[PDB]
Design a protein around this motif. Structure first.
Motif, PDB file in Angstrom:
ATOM      1  N   UNK A  96     -49.987 -14.512  25.063  1.00  0.00           N
ATOM      2  CA  UNK A  96     -50.382 -14.617  23.661  1.00  0.00           C
ATOM      3  C   UNK A  96     -49.993 -15.975  23.085  1.00  0.00           C
ATOM      4  N   UNK A  97     -48.803 -16.471  23.429  1.00  0.00           N
ATOM      5  CA  UNK A  97     -48.286 -17.679  22.795  1.00  0.00           C
ATOM      6  C   UNK A  97     -49.019 -18.946  23.214  1.00  0.00           C
ATOM      7  N   UNK A  98     -49.662 -18.965  24.380  1.00  0.00           N
ATOM      8  CA  UNK A  98     -50.213 -20.213  24.894  1.00  0.00           C
ATOM      9  C   UNK A  98     -51.720 -20.181  25.099  1.00  0.00           C
ATOM     10  N   UNK A  99     -52.255 -19.126  25.721  1.00  0.00           N
ATOM     11  CA  UNK A  99     -53.668 -19.119  26.107  1.00  0.00           C
ATOM     12  C   UNK A  99     -54.645 -19.174  24.930  1.00  0.00           C
ATOM     13  N   UNK A 100     -54.476 -18.426  23.825  1.00  0.00           N
ATOM     14  CA  UNK A 100     -55.348 -18.687  22.666  1.00  0.00           C
ATOM     15  C   UNK A 100     -55.111 -20.035  22.008  1.00  0.00           C
ATOM     16  N   UNK A 101     -53.941 -20.641  22.201  1.00  0.00           N
ATOM     17  CA  UNK A 101     -53.631 -21.902  21.541  1.00  0.00           C
ATOM     18  C   UNK A 101     -54.275 -23.108  22.212  1.00  0.00           C
ATOM     19  N   UNK A 102     -54.794 -22.965  23.434  1.00  0.00           N
ATOM     20  CA  UNK A 102     -55.413 -24.069  24.152  1.00  0.00           C
ATOM     21  C   UNK A 102     -56.917 -23.872  24.314  1.00  0.00           C
ATOM     22  N   UNK A 103     -57.359 -22.646  24.612  1.00  0.00           N
ATOM     23  CA  UNK A 103     -58.787 -22.392  24.766  1.00  0.00           C
ATOM     24  C   UNK A 103     -59.505 -22.357  23.423  1.00  0.00           C
ATOM     25  N   UNK A 104     -58.816 -21.941  22.364  1.00  0.00           N
ATOM     26  CA  UNK A 104     -59.417 -21.737  21.050  1.00  0.00           C
ATOM     27  C   UNK A 104     -58.888 -22.741  20.031  1.00  0.00           C
TER      28      UNK A 104
END
Ligand SMILES: CC(C)CCC[C@@H](C)[C@H]1CC[C@H]2[C@@H]3CC=C4C[C@@H](OC(=O)CCC(=O)O)CC[C@]4(C)[C@H]3CC[C@]12C
Ligand SMILES: C[N+](C)(C)CC#CCOC1=NOCC1
Lengths: 278, 57, 222, 339, 233
Positions: free
Chosen positions: A134-142
């Motif tokens: 949650x902390x990283x994957x939405x913060x880079x793809x989105x």
């Protein structure tokens, strides 16, 4: 190329240790029935997090510093940045569960492991990965699809919010600085109870304690110091130094099967049986 | 008298075993040998059975 | 898979469910083995074929088993600890108690099992060494060479010539324990009487240490 | 005199028995059997694993139909297995968690168990109400029960650590016959196929043949140097095999009344926990303390295979009535059906 | 000792609802699977529903699927049958059957009495014989046929035999085509192969008169035969 191939050769050699080091942890969990315990569940999940680094992260990063520019799709480095950052986040958070698991198994040797079951260990690993995802994957793809547009050059690939000193400092605390306080506090309290036991009725205690807390600080603190000065400054870090601290973050992936699994004598015997008697 | 009664019971037990009919080993060896050859086809461990008749496939 | 053996398979799955729910309950208790002579007074230790006793100290269940050379000793291979009770008053059977403790410590199936030692009737050995009775040095020919009597002494005061008589009998068993074992199992000595009521806490404190050593050994902190 | 004169008669009687024993050993059984083809390398593989036990398995017995088997473990559970489909038919809780033996009745309506409680508890399986209930608790033994075998639905013979063996009438609950004569602790017990005799191996390094209908020790066999842990009967009924702590299996003959073979090896130091024969008696299977079983040649005295599938001490062993399977339980809380 | 006491029934208007109940006493109700079997006055024996031990597997007949509900209460030792949207075709007597399933078990062993409810790819079992005159002291053979091979690949043929005496609940005689039930006299016997079955009675006497039923357990739905009535002379 006759002189700079040593950097290419050294990276793949220490990567080759990481795959065979981590794989030997999973197969020791399988061929040895005595190792199939609840305590060894976190050792397997740490090896699973560190297996993604060995086969994806360091292999794709070593092409970045050899070529000197990105040679893949624009919607392919973001997937690498999502996979690499979550797996490294999962590795640290798996160490934090181990520190909590070792804390309660020492201070409460009679009232903790009885209540802990296979269902209780599932949520230890689950939030070690869900919070990592949650902390990283939405913060880079989105990020380019939410605020503004693409900002990185086509020849480079960074996390694209390094310039903003709002979420870079916030995530640095929520990934490295806050867990490193808990692991330092808990392990000192664990060493305190080892000296308390011997006085009631010291050599290997400081040896393992130093090896745990220095193979993690040395391999990570160059990166988390370098990332903070790029929050306010822009180009004060040489690229030779930046990739040195960026690649030091994969050395913890190498030594995790050594300082956590091989401390157990049962794992060490199974490692020698599989390595020699193939 | 417990030691005397224990010693007297051992002698009577020894006498009941010292006078019994015994055959030679070669007759006992052939009895155990010929028992196996008369039942070698009925031993699934010695002679493996095909998996069609195996109930543990 | 027919209709009936599908229902028979569902019956089995309910059996595995019932087999794993009490195995979790069985894993929460601690099994203790009680050994001693006829004059040891091992029944009067914890005020709470085979005789099984239940007691709880600080909300963890304990199970103590009393049986009654020992072929059945391989059954108690996975017990937490063995509680051994010695008649420290009876100096005649003390050498037999040393030989019996030698067999438990050096047994093949008890090479990693700790022993909690209770020197029972410690008040009775005081009257044998403070008043006029048989000489302790007669049976054991090395006490009168009293050594380091009170080498370190923890008592508020109990006529400290009694304390050296206590320490010599205790040292005769620890010397057996430290002779062999290589640190795998540890003997914990204690001095007990019939009026003592803190015996349940002493096993609880020792069993906490025993589990701690097994936990520290798998992290290499010992 | 008195004890001195009586001890002299026992020595002369013991010398006569050995003198009569030596007059029958014309040739060695291993010498005579050195004319037939060896069985070769016996290769048996695990077929399925019976999981569900959570402690060390100490006893296992096959049923008559060679499909049902009962296993005893230290978790206080008796589990009846459907060995064909792995399914658990029953899970019988036990009043004592310390069981060293278990048995299955030839009819299949009853199972038995016993151990440190010195009680042979008999459980009724085929009842009404859809549950397994204890129907008889046999008391009277002083030592721990080491073995128990069902003669029928109303007769059972027990081995115990009071150096005695007993015969029980289950309906009455009384001890019909008491078998005395051993010196040491009796560890195991095997029954002849015709039921009229049984043999027991004890801790005095001796094996004794008994008459069930008379109560007297018919024969005594002394060739071991340590505790005899296991005993079995050759399917002929006139021979038996003993497993001992001295890393040595031996075969005795009733009519010859002396030792016949000695199964030993230089690389075997651990003792024998269980023994079992085959349908024809050519193969002698023995369980050891080194986490695996060994398959011996009962006529050739040569090792023909090793069943290595357990990572703890093999404690029990069993061969079916039809010879189609071998079941091995161990201290690793698993049961393996080999073929 | 074993008792299955039923309750409910009565005269219900069409479109109404009823909840039949069955109290179990004298046996371990939790380990037994339960079945509801009806019997119309102008028909034979028909299977309605089934609940397994632990309530993990529930099956219904096609005529009652969607409007009948079966449930059990293990601490209360009582199973229920909630029947909704009743029609005239549901006028019958509703028996409760206990049943257990393991190796060597004898399911459908005990039946109870029934509630008289009055409303104002399936294997077919064929019992060609309907009424047979029988004299005492003779031997009577009853044959049953199916639409499939009831033998399975595990060596089991799933054919059951029941006897309904006049004014009595049906009682199991032979389970799995060959094995005698508990309390049944040894004169009853069963033999046959796939699709061809035969029940044999030797030296018939009194209290051996009724309608014999033929039932298959190879695959739900559970289907009965038409019945073979025996009468005196
Ligand atoms: C730095 C942050 C982002 C780490 C991610 C949060 C969680 C993955 C960690 C941090 C604190 C941990 C908790 C610290 C204290 C406890 C209490 C502890 O209580 C017991 O020991 C009960 C016994 C049992 O677990 O059965 C159970 C584990 C738990 C919830 C730990 C579970 C994992 C937690 C929530
Ligand atoms: C730095 N690297 C991209 C090489 C891997 C990573 C990461 C995540 O950074 C963290 N700091 O502490 C916990 C996670």
């Amino acid at each position: 190329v006759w002189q700079v191939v040593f950097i290419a050769f050294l990276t793949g050699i220490l990567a080759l240790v990481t795959i065979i080091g981590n794989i030997l942890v999973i197969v020791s969990f399988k061929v040895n029935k005595q190792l199939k315990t609840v305590n060894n569940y976190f050792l397997l999940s740490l090896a699973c997090a560190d297996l993604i680094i060995g086969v994806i992260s360091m292999n794709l990063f070593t092409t970045y510093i050899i070529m000197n520019r990105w040679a893949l799709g624009n919607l392919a480095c973001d997937l690498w940045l999502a996979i690499d950052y979550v797996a490294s986040n999962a590795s640290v958070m798996n160490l934090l569960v181990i520190s909590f698991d070792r804390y309660f198994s020492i201070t409460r040797p009679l009232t903790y492991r009885a209540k802990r079951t296979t269902k209780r260990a599932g949520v230890m690993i689950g939030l070690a990965w869900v919070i990592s995802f949650v902390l990283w994957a939405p913060a880079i793809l989105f990020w380019q699809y939410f605020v503004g547009k693409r900002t990185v050059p086509p020849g480079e690939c960074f996390i694209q919010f390094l310039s903003e000193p709002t979420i870079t400092f916030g995530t640095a605390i929520a990934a490295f600085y806050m867990p490193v306080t808990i692991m330092t506090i808990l392990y000192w309290r664990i060493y305190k109870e080892t000296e308390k036991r011997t006085k009631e009725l010291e050599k290997k205690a400081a040896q393992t304690l130093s090896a745990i807390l220095l193979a993690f600080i040395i391999t990570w603190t160059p990166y988390n110091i370098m990332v903070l000065v790029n929050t306010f400054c822009d180009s004060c870090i040489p690229k030779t130094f930046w990739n040195l601290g960026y690649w030091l973050c994969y050395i913890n992936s190498t030594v995790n099967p050594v300082c956590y699994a091989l401390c157990n004598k049962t794992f060490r015997t199974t490692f020698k049986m599989l390595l020699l008697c193939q | 008298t417990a030691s005397i009664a224990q010693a007297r019971k051992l002698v009577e037990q020894l006498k009941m075993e010292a006078n019994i009919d015994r055959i030679k080993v070669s007759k006992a060896a052939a009895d155990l040998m010929a028992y196996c050859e008369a039942h070698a086809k009925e031993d699934p461990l010695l002679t493996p059975v095909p998996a069609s008749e195996n109930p543990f496939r | 898979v027919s209709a009936e053996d599908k229902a028979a398979a569902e019956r089995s799955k309910m059996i595995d469910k019932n087999l794993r729910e009490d195995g979790e309950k069985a894993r929460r208790t601690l099994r203790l083995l009680l050994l001693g002579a006829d004059n040891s007074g091992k029944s009067t230790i914890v005020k709470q074929g085979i005789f099984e006793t239940k007691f709880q100290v600080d909300k963890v269940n304990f199970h103590m088993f009393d049986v009654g050379r020992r072929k059945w000793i391989q059954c108690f291979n996975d017990v937490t600890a063995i509680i051994f009770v010695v008649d420290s008053s009876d100096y005649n059977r003390l050498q037999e108690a040393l030989n019996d403790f030698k067999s438990i410590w050096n047994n093949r199936w008890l090479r990693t099992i700790s022993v909690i030692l209770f020197l029972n009737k410690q008040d009775l050995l005081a009257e044998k060494v403070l008043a006029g009775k048989s000489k302790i040095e007669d049976y054991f020919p090395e006490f009168a060479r009293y050594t380091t009597p009170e080498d370190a002494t923890p008592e508020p005061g109990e006529d400290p010539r009694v304390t050296r008589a206590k320490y010599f009998i205790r040292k005769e068993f620890v010397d057996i324990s430290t002779a062999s074992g290589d640190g795998r199992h540890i003997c914990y000595p204690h001095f007990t009487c019939a009026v003592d009521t803190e015996n349940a806490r002493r096993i609880f404190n020792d069993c906490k240490d025993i589990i701690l050593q097994m936990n520290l050994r798998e992290y290499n902190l010992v | 005199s008195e004890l001195d004169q009586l001890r002299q008669e026992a020595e002369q009687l013991k010398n006569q028995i050995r003198d009569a024993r030596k007059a029958c050993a014309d040739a060695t059984l291993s010498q005579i059997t050195n004319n037939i083809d060896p069985v070769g390398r016996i290769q048996m593989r695990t077929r399925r694993t019976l999981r569900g036990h959570l402690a060390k398995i100490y006893a296992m017995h096959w049923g008559t139909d060679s499909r049902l088997l009962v296993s005893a473990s230290q978790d206080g559970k008796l589990i009846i297995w459907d060995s064909y489909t792995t399914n658990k038919v029953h899970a019988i809780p036990l009043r004592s968690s310390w069981v060293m033996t278990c048995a299955y009745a030839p009819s299949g309506n009853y199972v038995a168990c016993g151990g440190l409680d010195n009680i042979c508890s008999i459980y009724n399986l085929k009842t009404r109400e859809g549950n397994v209930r204890v129907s008889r608790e046999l008391a009277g033994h002083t030592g721990y029960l080491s073995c128990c075998r069902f003669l029928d639905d109303n007769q059972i013979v027990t081995s115990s650590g009071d150096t005695t063996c007993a015969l029980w009438d289950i309906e009455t609950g009384q001890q019909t016959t008491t078998f005395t004569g051993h010196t040491g602790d009796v560890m195991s017990l095997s029954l002849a196929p015709d039921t009229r005799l049984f043999v027991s191996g004890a801790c005095d390094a001796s094996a004794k043949l008994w008459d069930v209908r008379e109560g007297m020790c018919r024969q005594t066999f002394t060739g071991h140097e340590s505790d005899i842990n296991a005993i079995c009967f050759f399917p002929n009924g006139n021979a038996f095999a003993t497993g001992s702590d001295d890393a040595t299996c031996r075969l005795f003959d009733l009519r010859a009344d002396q030792e016949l073979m000695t199964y030993s090896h230089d690389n075997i130091i651990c003792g024998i926990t269980s023994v079992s024969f085959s349908k024809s008696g050519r193969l002698l299977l023995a369980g050891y303390d080194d986490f695996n079983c060994n398959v011996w040649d009962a006529l050739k005295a040569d090792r023909a295979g090793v069943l290595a599938g357990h990572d703890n001490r093999v404690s029990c062993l069993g061969v079916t009535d039809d010879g189609m399977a071998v079941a091995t339980g161990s201290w690793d809380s698993f049961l393996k059906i080999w073929n | 000792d074993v008792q299955l006491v039923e309750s409910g029934g009565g005269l219900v208007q069409p479109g109404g609802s009823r909840k039949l109940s069955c109290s179990a006493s004298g046996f371990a109700f939790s380990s037994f699977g339960m079945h509801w079997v009806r019997q119309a006055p102008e028909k034979g024996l028909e299977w309605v529903a089934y609940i397994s031990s632990g309530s993990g597997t529930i099956y219904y007949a096609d005529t009652v699927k969607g409007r009948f509900t079966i449930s059990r209460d293990d601490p209360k030792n009582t199973l229920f049958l909630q029947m909704t949207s009743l029609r005239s075709e549901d006028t019958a007597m509703y028996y409760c059957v206990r049943s257990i399933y393991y190796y060597g078990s004898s399911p459908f062993d005990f039946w109870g009495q029934g509630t008289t409810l009055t409303v104002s790819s399936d294997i077919v079992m064929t019992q060609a014989t309907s009424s047979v005159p029988v004299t005492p002291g003779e031997s009577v053979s009853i044959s049953c046929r199916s639409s499939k091979s009831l033998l399975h690949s595990n060596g089991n043929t799933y054919l059951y035999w029941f006897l309904q005496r006049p004014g009595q609940s049906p009682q199991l005689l032979i389970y799995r085509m060959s094995n005698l039930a508990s309390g049944v006299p040894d004169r009853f016997s069963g033999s046959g192969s796939g699709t061809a079955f035969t029940l044999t009675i030797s030296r018939l006497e009194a209290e051996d008169v009724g309608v014999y039923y033929c039932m298959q357990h190879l695959e739900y739905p559970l289907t009965f035969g038409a019945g073979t009535k025996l009468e005196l002379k």
